[PDB]
Amino acid sequence: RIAGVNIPDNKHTVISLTYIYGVGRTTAQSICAATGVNPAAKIKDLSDEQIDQLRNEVAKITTEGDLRREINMNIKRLMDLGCYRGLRHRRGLPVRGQRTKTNARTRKGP
RNA sequence: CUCGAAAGCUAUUUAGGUAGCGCCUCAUGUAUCACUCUGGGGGGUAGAGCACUGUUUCGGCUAGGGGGUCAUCCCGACUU
Ligand SMILES: [Mg+2]
Ligand SMILES: [Mg+2]
Ligand SMILES: [Mg+2]
């Protein structure tokens, strides 16, 4: 609603744009370069004018409310085909080819 | 010589005792009473019924738990 989500205050611009969930850190360094907003000032000190140009960039990359939708179909395409990358992805095993006998605990919990 | 019962009720340290009412008798009064016919009158019993509360048999049409279950990593449902 503010830029797609709420944006914190009393912070620099590149840090503030990070919470938009679809722009990391290197991408938000291009947006202040392409628009011209100084990151060295806070978001409080800005004008209420050029935020549309920041909002123009949000309408060109992705939005987290639909980013998580479309990335699920990338998962969902892998599951319903029954390919090996979606075979373990149904179950909960690691995917990229890690070791399974021990230590793969961030995909199985405590 | 004339008339003629009861073994009921309530209470009881009561139950085989006793006391009030019900039933007999003799007096005094006073006027109602039985039987039957024609009336008016409420009722919930025998019977009967399944509208309620329950209980019972068969049949259909089914909701379902799904019983099978094509069975789908895990999801459709195949089938009945
Ligand atoms: Mg006699
Ligand atoms: Mg005695
Ligand atoms: Mg009867």
Q: Does domain A70-110 have CATH number 3.10.20.70?
A: no
- The 3-state DSSP class for residue A42 equals strand
Distance A109 CA to ligand 2 centre (A): 95
CA–CA separation, A37 vs A34, rounded Å? 8
CA–CA separation, A8 vs A45, rounded Å? 13
Question: A106 and A91 in contact (C-beta within 8 Å)?
Answer: no
Nucleotide with minimal C1' distance from the CA of A80 is: B73
The CA-atom distances, in angstroms, between A18 and each of A29, A70, A73, A80, A108 are 10, 20, 25, 34, 29
- The 3-state DSSP class for residue A106 equals coil
CA–CA separation, A10 vs A96, rounded Å? 40
CA–CA separation, A46 vs A35, rounded Å? 13
Domain boundaries, chain A: 1-69, 70-110
Resolution in A: 3.3
Consecutive H or E run containing A52: helix A51-58
- Listing DSSP states for A12-31 in one string gives BHHHHGGGGSS--SSHHHHH
Output the six-digit token pair for A76. 């969902």
| CATH of the domain spanning A1-69 | 1.10.8.50
Question: A52 and A41 in contact (C-beta within 8 Å)?
Answer: no
Interatomic distance A37 CA / B48 C1' (Å): 100
Long-range Cβ pairs for the range A51-58 (8 Å, 24+):
A51/A3, A54/A3, A54/A17, A55/A3, A57/A31, A58/A3, A58/A4, A58/A20, A58/A23
**Cα angle A64, A68, A74; round to 5:** 140
What sign does the CA torsion over A14, A38, A43, A35 have?
negative
What technique determined this structure? cryo-EM
Q: Indicate yes or no: strand B within 7 A of the C-beta of A91.
A: yes
